[PDB]
Symmetry: D2
Subunit: 365 residues, 4 copies
């Protein structure tokens, strides 16, 4: 009566203790290159039982969903990018900037593939994102000590076949290639404490995923909208709309083929618009070849991985979100940085003393 309701049928972010032998995966974006309030672009939050937390992809729009988990910014410092599509990493800037004012005190750590040359790789990309936002950076840095505005980039060969790219505190990430637009993109396997979660990213059907994702607890893979849907919605000629499901993208039928090969405890289809008139065709495509546990992902779906089961719930999270304070500590600023104001601009100040008099007076007692 006055007690707490156990095993809730929805995930309320911040309301639940994580078990030492438990993973929590939250889809903070499941969408497309088209922006949509119901679906941010691809983003995954992993919370391990040992207190380690990772983001895999941080697409355009995902930061709103990520900020809604009531997780302090200092705990969301490690970011893996499958690839360098705006719809895979475009909110990294919002996580760099917003997280910093939210009181991150550590640099961002970013693991992402190379390309076929320096300027098609993750290091080039991050380096120039930081030059793009130089004004934000210098103006911020005069006051706030600049350490957390660092991004340490760990680039790995996109070509490598299931090679470790991260080994720390009992946690392994391995990568392997995808086939998606051009050379560069990868899939991630996260291994910890008996478990294995697989982040496909984006790819046409490839020989590497079905091999290295085998027997995962949670397998995530591109599952595209049908050729019929492509023709109804984007008004594509049948030949173009066919090509999209065979050459550019993993079809639902293809997705089911791969998860039949993988044999996960739980499969996840993402990277399609989950509407009242698309999802059923795509579910049917999958079920042609795969009959095991299947999630049809949308924004703020959550997976609990225990020894017993893989549980799918929806997260009920605050739309009117706020930064939530962490156990970190005020770092000691930098009184050796050059101010970015001229006196021509500071001579613009408006005398507002008389309008602010009444509230300024009550406020100081």
């Amino acid at each position: 009566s006055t007690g707490i309701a156990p095993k809730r049928y929805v995930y309320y972010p911040g309301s639940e203790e994580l078990g030492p032998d438990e993973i929590r995966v939250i889809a903070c974006g499941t969408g497309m290159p088209t922006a949509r309030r119901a679906q941010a672009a691809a983003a995954w939050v992993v919370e391990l039982g040992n207190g380690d937390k990772f983001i895999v992809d941080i697409g355009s729009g995902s930061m709103a969903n990520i900020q809604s988990l009531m997780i302090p910014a200092n705990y969301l410092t490690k970011i893996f990018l499958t690839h360098l599509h705006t719809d895979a990493w475009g909110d990294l800037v919002s996580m760099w900037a917003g997280g910093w004012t939210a009181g991150r005190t550590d640099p961002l750590e970013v693991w992402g593939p190379s390309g076929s040359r320096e300027d098609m790789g993750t290091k080039y990309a991050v380096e120039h994102m930081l030059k793009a936002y130089n004004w934000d950076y210098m103006t911020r840095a005069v006051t706030i000590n600049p350490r957390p505005g660092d991004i340490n980039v760990h680039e790995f060969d996109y070509r490598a076949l299931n090679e470790v790219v991260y080994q720390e505190n009992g946690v392994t990430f391995r990568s392997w290639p995808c086939i998606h637009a051009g050379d560069g993109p990868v899939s991630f396997a996260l291994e910890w404490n008996g478990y294995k979660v697989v982040f496909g990213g984006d790819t046409a059907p490839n020989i590497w995923y079905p091999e290295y994702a085998k027997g995962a607890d949670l397998a995530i893979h591109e599952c595209w909208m049908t050729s019929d849907q492509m023709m109804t919605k984007y008004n594509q000629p049948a030949q173009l709309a066919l090509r999209i499901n065979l050459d550019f993208h993993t079809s639902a039928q293809s997705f089911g083929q791969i998860m039949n090969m993988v044999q996960p405890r739980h499969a996840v289809a993402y990277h399609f618009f989950n509407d009242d008139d698309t999802r059923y065709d795509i579910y049917t495509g999958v079920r042609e070849n795969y009959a095991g546990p299947l999630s049809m992902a949308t924004d703020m779906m959550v997976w609990n991985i225990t020894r017993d089961a893989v549980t799918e719930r929806m997260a009920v999270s605050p739309d009117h979100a706020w930064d939530v304070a962490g156990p970190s500590e005020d770092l000691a600023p930098d009184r050796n940085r050059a101010s970015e104001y001229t006196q021509y601009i500071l001579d613009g100040r408006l005398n507002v003393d008389e309008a602010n008099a009444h509230w300024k007076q009550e406020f100081m007692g």
Copy 2:
């Protein structure tokens, strides 16, 4: 009975004809550097009765709201940036890539301010952004004509006092400085067909906005959360919370003084968390010194400016947004372009012919 409901109490994007002597302004972001599903970072869509349209600021998260307006990518090629904060242009990338895969045939045109030196200006910011996303650009330009993957930058002097920065088809944008983090930030005024709309951007109270926003049909200005609210939501020390409303940002009372001076037909307050326990005190603050027509901005608020009236209303728009096709032509992909695939990645294609045979044959008829 069978008839369209005229002068509807909410705005349905795509449902109304825009009159030739009418302007329509929609707030696609009203929020803060903290992400929130309820409020994107700053973005304004402006629609003139002569068919000209404009985005003023395109902050982190605004793209979902902009795509909810059912406006073809080709009609939204022109972007004005008040300043180079993540939360004022972080989504220029989503508009670039998105509008390109959605059928934008023309390059993006971008106006923003210079800084005190090259690497503090818009020219440098956008140049290094295109480099940041070079993997996206080069891959996409293989399959899709590259001309609309261009961004033509129009850098204007941030120091200029109320000087034109755009003039085209009887439309003028003027700029004047803001006082905000460091040199470069501006406010804009759009002058067309007897009308004046002011976009304040981000600023502590300054002597220029009161002078140059005078007699505006719609006046927009930063209006910050109360010091008491700074000390409650974030747990600041009194001093730091006082300084924020007296030095770093415009207080409600300040906003009130400025709009008192400006005597706009209609004034808009934005850039605070519009919540059921914040908005009222901020409202009371404005009303200390300003008694005129006022909107307290939140996401998808819209203003109709006619000779007779300045109407405020809410837009009711699809969360499940799709791109909408515009009048323009198919453009031809440049075939003198090297693949970004090596044979090593392409040798990974999976045989999926069988799994896909069922739907495949049915679709070719």
Copy 3:
């Protein structure tokens, strides 16, 4: 550019003219006798191209949706009830009082079935409803003309096999029995201009629906949650979950059998929780036997029925709904209506003339 978007991918209620050979059906509730913000209890609004409009069912909570369609109360006076579940006609009371404050000028017309005896029928039910709300009726009628507060009831015989219960202006409703908890429940067929819409109400699988619903433009039918689901969600013993889907309700597999028999242009399944982890099994259940066009119903779904197609879309409507005014002229109150105030209560009034002095001067010019 300044024009309307044609054939929009979502329905904006109030924004689209109905053709003279066109029907529009909006699901205003698709849920259970359990309350849910995301699904109201059963309710349908039918709009014919000839100007006539009808509600079939008005279950608990449906009114907030019906009010969102921006339809004047004076156009929504004709209500047919499939049966007498709270979850089938619970919001009749809200349509009765709400419509009347908001300027309905004609009486409500209700068609509902008889039962096995007097006190199991719509006549008894509505006579005693009006008694329950006698305080509301008498207090409202001092001030507003009592005529719109009349309910004319049209009790049809629940036993009749596919017999006319309404025939006016080229429109026909037939009824036939359901098997649902107790004698009384019916399904209806609306016939107009060569269109046939079937409102299944609630039923266990019966021999009448497949016969009388055959060749429907749009066929609607109960489609219950699976026996696995009933156990998972509600904590059921194995053999009671089995009984729900074979005796009490129409299983998804049965729904497929019926719609296989009916061969409609479009079948609609409804009266199940449409959730991210219920919908897909239900859909696969139907698909075992029925292959034709299907909608899995949710709240605010809309079908456009033309000669050429049956289109499913989602309605996008104001959560902040208001009454909308219809042309219908003024209606003169009574001065043969006793006040319901005694002077004991009326002597309780508070002097507030001075607290209201400021805005009461300002307002009288």
Copy 4:
């Protein structure tokens, strides 16, 4: 990191153990006679540290919000009605029928006022409500035990001044007249453990509320839209728009004056449409005379009453709500009780054996 985020900024229903010296109050409706997904008609949940729970009003729409709180049906048995408006008790039926099917064990208890004669009181109201829903009552009593279908009514004298109408377990409700549409409406005071909560219900300014609601921890009173907002929305003439805020309802200005008198810890305004262009004018009305803590209510607003603070939050709760089981027992049917089917109806059962055998088999194994 693996911890639970404490003293959280949103209330997640089901997630917070209630303190023994604490009251929790949720607005489950705040609306008008007009239906709206944003605002249910008036409803209030009170939870007490002794584990007693209470509903005060249960207006049309409210049940969807009540069910979102994840409270078992069996702990929600006691309803107090301020008055007999459809928008104050229209969803009692929904709590009656819906609780019962979800394992409520005890009858509902209902406390409402009498009127000037039997047919204007709560005993008469509820008696005829049960007759109205006789079919539903009689059919449900065949397959589930009939006792939780009962509604034990406690009618009290509306005219009484501050008299005890409930007295159990250290909890005490008092009532006093309102002036609302006609004789019969009241306000409640809930007194428990040195806390006073006051439920305004609906009234024009009266001499009883200020007297009897003095020293209230939480104090709730009608507060109406402005005359200007009445003229603009409902196309009123000038004089009738004036009569509404002086005679029939309590103005913002009068809400101020009355709350100035009562000097509660925390004042609540409700019964106005809480919209981005209405609420502000209403805030400013109330602050002409009241400067104490003030909530402008909307659906799912919650107050925590502790010794130290009256804390406002917003509840973030599932739209896709479900019943949660309580510790109550599995109560048993009745064979005595006569079936409500005739052989005429059962003779209509369709044979669906072949359709259902495949799922029927796998369920039993």
